[PDB]
Design an enzyme around this catalytic site. Structure first.
Site, PDB file in Angstrom:
ATOM      1  CG  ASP A   1      -1.795  -1.195   1.343  1.00 49.95           C
ATOM      2  OD1 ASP A   1      -2.454  -1.562   0.345  1.00 49.95           O
ATOM      3  OD2 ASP A   1      -1.836  -1.793   2.439  1.00 49.95           O
TER       4      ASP A   1
ATOM      5  CB  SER B   1       1.194   6.571   3.207  1.00 49.59           C
ATOM      6  OG  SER B   1       0.220   5.870   3.962  1.00 49.59           O
ATOM      7  NE  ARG B   2      -2.003   2.402  -3.929  1.00 49.45           N
ATOM      8  CZ  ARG B   2      -2.139   2.851  -5.180  1.00 49.45           C
ATOM      9  NH1 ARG B   2      -1.261   3.701  -5.716  1.00 49.45           N
ATOM     10  NH2 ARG B   2      -3.180   2.450  -5.910  1.00 49.45           N
ATOM     11  CB  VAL B   3      -3.726   4.194   4.164  1.00 53.39           C
ATOM     12  CG1 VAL B   3      -4.741   4.412   5.284  1.00 53.39           C
ATOM     13  CG2 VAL B   3      -3.740   2.730   3.736  1.00 53.39           C
ATOM     14  N   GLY B   4      -2.940   7.196   3.646  1.00 54.41           N
ATOM     15  CA  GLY B   4      -2.841   8.642   3.865  1.00 54.41           C
ATOM     16  C   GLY B   4      -3.482   9.152   5.148  1.00 54.41           C
TER      17      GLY B   4
END
Lengths: 132, 154, 285, 238, 154, 154
Positions: free
Chosen positions: D76, D101-104
């Site tokens: 991710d 960080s694709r979750v962010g």
């Protein structure tokens, strides 16, 4: 009041309307107010004091001349600085440089006027810096 | 794969590089890529770690400037960077050392240098106490005292 | 080739592109500042001209040594160059004009003297044995009149006491950021047409008109030298914009060429590596 | 990396066909099957979770090598570390520009999410405009203050070994540097200014810290500004 | 492997290069990569050898400056290198030549230059005898006399 | 080989840029980097192509002047560029659009804008019909009529 401009070759230093402009001419201290006769005179290396009512402002001027009209008052000079924009340590080192050289020089010399004028520039810069 | 896999089995690594050996810097030890597990204030002390880290930052900055200097020139840098370049080259030469076993290659006697003496030498170079000595004075000597003596010959 | 060798070069040229691009902006900022400083120096000079022309207008049989031409035994030459390089042919062009002019005009080194304003010119003249009487270096990018006052006063003083009988100045005249033209302009003797044509006005003088005139005429000659410096500085920074603008465009061209070579080698390396592994496996079976 | 090489050893010894860097066709499948088991379960399934931190050892920064390429795409996000930053003294040596960080923001509390917006903006502009850094005092005041701000935020992002900071203490430290309370203090004193500030906040102004612990949000900003300014007068630069 | 292994079977090699061909330099012969076993004082004479190696020394320095010249041009070069680059570019163009077989393509009639004229022409260029002449005068001509003649109508 | 083989089949590219998303320009489609094979007078009309190319030329000019504007200032620009910069900023905002799916994010209801309305809107901006309107009017609207309708509310 009368509009006053203190200027050098590179920038404008002072701008505003003054009650009186106290400048040290080569012949004597001028007190230029509004409605003065058209006049041009060289100035000694000295502080130029501008009174705007309660506020007094000293500008360290060296190698300049005054130009008066009833409408406008101009001062063009080699250098002109307000107290806040003077390099104090540079002036002290310049003072100590030129005064110690001048002590071992007679008036009949090539470099006497150059050092004496540079010494006057340094001391006037220190006078105007101490007023702040 | 062979040296890459070997790295996992070591507590300290002396990373030799040809570009240092090509200049004549012997032993040709990479000052950045060489590593140790005991390089920390707890083992070697606060002064040793600070001086060692100071050497690496000066040499890192010199490498960043090398490609810039090569095309655009030396005088276009700032006064801070010019001083960093001068000290980096002296540090790099003081990192060199004549070995007892390599007298037939160096053409001079080998030197042993204690740790406390080594730390003192590089500390004085970082502080700027040997800025007037030439580069060759730092090249192929033991202590910092020998570098002061060598500069008189030049 | 070798990937390690190419990727080293890509890092070098990419950093060199960033600095050359940055120095274009730094030069362009200083170009604007030099022109803004010239906008203050011009009315300063015109004001001194106004008072000089006013004195001359109200004086019987007006004359002064600085305004009068005379036979030329010797000539003074002020030459403006930069200290730093990376300004294209800026210094090369102006020094070519000085070399051509001196060879055609003069038959000996005793006929002239040189005031070297700038390090690049100083080094050129001293290397070829030119008569460099005085010099000045380390002038700031946005200069004050005080930074050239000593050499200007010395040059003006040498005219006044007849050490030489003429003073001209060489510099690159600013036309645009791309175009800068080498020129020679006369300083002393001053032309009476262009100095005494200011607006005339009635002033009282203290102590007198002669004493004021004696201060202002050398002071006017200083501002002419200073205005040439500011204009030469504008030409320097404009020339640096163009040269480093080209160096930025050249860096991007080279960076593409290196990126093609890198990806040629990367693809070739993977093709060879995998082919040797599969060839080795087929040899067993 | 060493797990992949161990599976390659067995596959090659079992004579399964080799591909790029001699790995078999199921080495991607190997790591994807591993890493997908790490997850955040739903409320119906109990709400538990497994967080994964896989490692990859690159060789000379080659992120486009086969095993790195596999694990980069599977995950991710990536925390890219670099040697240049490590040797310079930026530790941890995190390259913020390329790290993702694709979750962010979803993985942060409200306090951290608010302060971190300016931090990523300021740090991007600093390293972008780092070519002007050597040209000292020639620049306009717009780019002057951004360089002064940028180099100070780098010192806050530096951190010693084995000294993890609580999230409530992080947000105040980031809040202080981003709003300009360390512009007055010199660059070399920023790390000492941080340590003494958090010592001051833990002892005296614990109510502001406890608000962030409980609510997960910033306290009254003007109250926080007042608390930092009391410390700033007591601090002695050098 | 194919051209690499071929080199062993040759006394002389003419190494053509695409970069020279795209510049208009025909024949596109690399003057440094092209070699011969009989380039020595014993076979071709002392003057031929000295002039040949003098040409290659100028071109080798010009080749070393290509990375700098590509970025910054010729403005930051030293006075010595400016002269070397100027002579190298003239040498590079005088090395080109119109071919009898290439009359159909270019339109210029072909030229046959004797060895004595070739040695004399490049000798005069090395001695600075044609520094005044422009670059295009050296391009696509036979003898050095034809380069002097071409410069007049230019 | 993977992208090269894929690009053999592609007819267009939609290139999303992060800097446009940071400015609030949604959808964050790069108007210069995004391309299409069918942008021609054959497929779309002569007017569509003229307007599309005009938008590109205006936005490209504005993009080139970013370094000049930032350091030298707006007074450095000529009278032609000042107008181009003004129209480019209006054009860049009119390229943004409220989405039916992104009503939660923007707040406003979504808009479907036909091709003829899109061509007409950007045509009128290039011709200078809406130079006197404020820049916020062009931001986050459908047709050119909605931009004029927004101007009275500001």
């Amino acid at each position: 009041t009368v509009q006053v401009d203190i200027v050098t070759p590179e920038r404008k230093v002072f701008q505003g309307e003054a009650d009186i402009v106290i400048a040290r001419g080569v012949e004597g201290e001028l007190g230029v107010m509004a409605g003065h006769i058209p006049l041009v005179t060289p100035l000694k290396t000295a502080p130029v004091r501008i009174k705007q009512g309660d506020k007094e402002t000293l500008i360290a001027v060296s190698g300049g001349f005054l130009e008066v009209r009833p409408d406008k008052v101009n001062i063009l000079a080699d250098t002109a600085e307000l107290p806040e924009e003077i390099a104090v340590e540079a002036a002290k080192k310049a003072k100590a440089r030129h005064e110690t050289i001048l002590k071992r020089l007679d008036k009949t010399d090539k470099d006497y006027l150059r050092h004496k004028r540079a010494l006057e520039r340094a001391e006037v810069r220190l006078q105007v810096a101490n007023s702040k | 794969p062979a040296p890459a896999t070997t790295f996992a089995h070591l507590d300290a690594t002396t990373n030799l590089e040809r570009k240092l050996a090509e200049m004549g810097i012997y032993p040709a030890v990479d000052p950045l890529a060489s590593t140790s597990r005991i390089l920390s204030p707890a083992v070697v002390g606060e002064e040793h770690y600070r001086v060692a880290r100071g050497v690496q930052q000066v040499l890192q900055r010199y490498n960043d400037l090398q490609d810039i200097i090569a095309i655009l020139g030396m005088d276009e840098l700032s006064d801070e960077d010019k001083l960093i370049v001068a000290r980096a080259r002296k540090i790099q030469r003081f990192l060199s050392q004549p070995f007892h076993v390599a007298e037939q290659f160096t053409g001079m006697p080998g030197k042993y240098v204690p740790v406390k003496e080594t730390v003192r030498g590089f500390k004085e170079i970082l502080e700027g106490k040997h800025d007037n000595l030439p580069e060759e004075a730092f090249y192929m000597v033991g202590t910092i005292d020998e570098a002061v003596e060598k500069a008189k010959k030049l | 080739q070798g990937m390690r060798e190419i990727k080293r070069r890509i890092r070098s040229v990419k950093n060199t592109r960033q600095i050359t691009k940055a120095m274009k902006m730094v030069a362009a900022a200083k170009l604007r500042r030099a022109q803004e400083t010239a906008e203050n120096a011009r009315p300063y000079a015109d004001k001194i001209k106004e008072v000089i022309s006013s004195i001359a207008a109200g004086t019987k049989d007006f004359s002064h040594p600085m305004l009068e031409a005379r036979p030329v035994k010797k000539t003074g030459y002020m030459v403006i160059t930069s200290d730093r390089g990376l300004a294209g042919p800026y210094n090369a062009n102006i020094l070519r004009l000085v070399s051509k002019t001196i060879e055609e005009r003069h038959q000996s080194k005793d006929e002239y003297v040189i005031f070297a304003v700038g390090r690049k010119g100083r080094d050129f003249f001293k290397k070829r044995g030119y008569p460099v009487v005085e010099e000045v270096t380390g002038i700031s990018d946005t200069p004050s009149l005080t930074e050239i006052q000593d050499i200007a006063q010395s040059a003006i003083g040498m005219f006044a006491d007849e050490t030489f009988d003429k003073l001209t100045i060489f510099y690159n005249e600013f036309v645009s950021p791309i175009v800068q033209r080498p020129v020679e302009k006369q300083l002393l003797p001053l032309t009476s047409e262009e100095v005494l044509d200011g607006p005339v006005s009635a002033y009282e003088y203290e102590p007198d008109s002669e004493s004021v005139l004696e201060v202002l005429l050398p002071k006017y000659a200083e501002t002419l030298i200073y205005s040439a410096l500011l204009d030469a500085k504008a030409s320097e920074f404009g020339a640096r914009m163009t040269a480093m603008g080209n160096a930025t465009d050249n860096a991007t061209e080279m960076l593409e060429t290196l990126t093609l070579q890198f990806n040629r080698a990367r693809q070739a390396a993977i093709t060879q590596e995998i082919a040797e592994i599969v060839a080795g496996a087929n040899a067993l079976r | 990396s060493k797990q992949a090489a161990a599976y390659r050893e067995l596959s090659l010894l079992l004579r399964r066909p080799p591909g790029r860097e001699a790995y078999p066709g199921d080495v991607f499948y190997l790591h994807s099957r591993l890493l997908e088991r790490a997850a955040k379960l739903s409320d119906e399934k109990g709400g538990g979770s497994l967080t994964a931190l896989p490692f990859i050892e690159t060789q000379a920064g080659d992120v486009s090598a086969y095993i790195p390429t596999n694990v980069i795409s599977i995950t991710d996000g990536q925390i890219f570390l670099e040697s240049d930053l490590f040797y310079s003294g930026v530790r941890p040596a995190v390259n913020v520009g390329i790290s993702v960080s694709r979750v962010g923001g979803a993985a942060q509390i409200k306090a951290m999410k608010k302060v971190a917006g300016t931090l990523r903006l300021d740090l991007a502009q600093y390293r972008e405009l780092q070519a002007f850094a050597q040209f000292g005092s020639d620049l306009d005041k717009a780019t002057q203050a951004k360089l002064n701000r940028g180099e100070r935020t780098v010192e806050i992002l530096k951190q010693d070994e084995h000294k993890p900071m609580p999230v409530e203490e992080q947000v105040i430290s980031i809040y202080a540097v981003t709003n300009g309370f360390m512009d007055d203090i010199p660059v070399e004193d920023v790390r000492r200014f941080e340590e003494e500030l958090l010592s001051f906040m833990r002892a005296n102004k614990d109510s502001l810290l406890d608000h962030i612990r409980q609510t997960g949000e910033l306290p009254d900003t003007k109250e926080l500004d007042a608390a930092i300014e009391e410390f700033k007068k007591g601090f002695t630069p050098s």
